[PDB]
Nucleic acid binder design. Sequence first.
RNA 1: GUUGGUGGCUGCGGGAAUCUCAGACACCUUAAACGCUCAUGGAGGCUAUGUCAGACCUGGGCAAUGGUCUGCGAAGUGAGAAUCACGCGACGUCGUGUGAGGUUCAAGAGU
Length: 302
Amino acid sequence: MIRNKAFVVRLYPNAAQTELINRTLGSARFVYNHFLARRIAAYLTYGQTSSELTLLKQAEETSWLSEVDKFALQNSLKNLETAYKNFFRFPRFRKKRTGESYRTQFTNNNIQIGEGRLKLPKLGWVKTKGQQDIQGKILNVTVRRIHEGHYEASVLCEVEIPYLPAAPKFAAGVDVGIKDFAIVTDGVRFKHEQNPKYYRSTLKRLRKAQQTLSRRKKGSARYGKAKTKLARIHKRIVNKRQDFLHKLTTSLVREYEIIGAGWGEFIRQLEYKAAWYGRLVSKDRDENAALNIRREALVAAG
RNA sequence: GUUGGUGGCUGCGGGAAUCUCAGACACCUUAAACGCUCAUGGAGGCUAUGUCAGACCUGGGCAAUGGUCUGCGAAGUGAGAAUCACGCGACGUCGUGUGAGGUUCAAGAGU
């Protein structure tokens, strides 16, 4: 019943509270590159990297590392350790991107949920919009920068999600459609889920944005504006796709107890919402393909 | 140089659709296309079809035929505005601070 959910709330920090977010993202990237260089030159362990980070915080040259939140740097070091272990079971550096995130752990109520505000360790009260009601213990907050004027805080909480009631239909055969995104079928009626509106149009706008960026000189101010616009259109495409898939998968979970482009997001959302709401997933051409998928999935399940 | 009817390009409204509002518009019963302003800039920008190859393809090779915009100024470059209500400061505006923003549905995300 207790599920880990990420109440992504749009942050609206002031000038100081966003300067600090920038200086913490840069610091988490810096303490990543520095210790990656140290690890590469070594051929360090968790204790060694923690001690060297503490010395850097006390170092005169890099004293500003202690200004940013400590949990961001600790989790940056943890991510570096995991990446190094995966490469051993020497990854590339971290490049300054538009979309960069840091996460802060929870300790002695350093992070608190306000009405239209969010409390963060070095930031104070950060104004938020669309604060979905939270009734669980905060685990960590992934303060991020989608692009220049867009910040978010994936407040990971342990909120007890309740299982949904009994479902009207027993299965929903879904398969990748040619024209439609997918065709669902309870078994008799073929509800063809058409692709979300203005999806080819927004892909065309994405191509125009990519062409505009490639026409500009890197490191320029107008190049920065075009890069931000490309990031905005990427975020808009992600929002449209994820909203289409959220609505489709919630409709599938509510309407059907079983659910037999962006298909990766579709499958991820379907699986985690099936786990959350108490469902199961078994993992003429379109209609017959969907019917066969439904029949085989139901046979495998039972 | 037009009172009027439909359409969505951009900005805020957390997300999607829709809607107000605002910056521009576009056609005339049609439902498509497009963000805008100023300065600089000086010849290119967009698109359809063909190619495996400019969104270059995989040390080798291809970048063709048309339409469309464009010297009445393209790309690039620098600077700006784009919801509402209260104040504060300075000359009806400009900054600056705070607050609010409709309906339905939805909302785990990240290296």
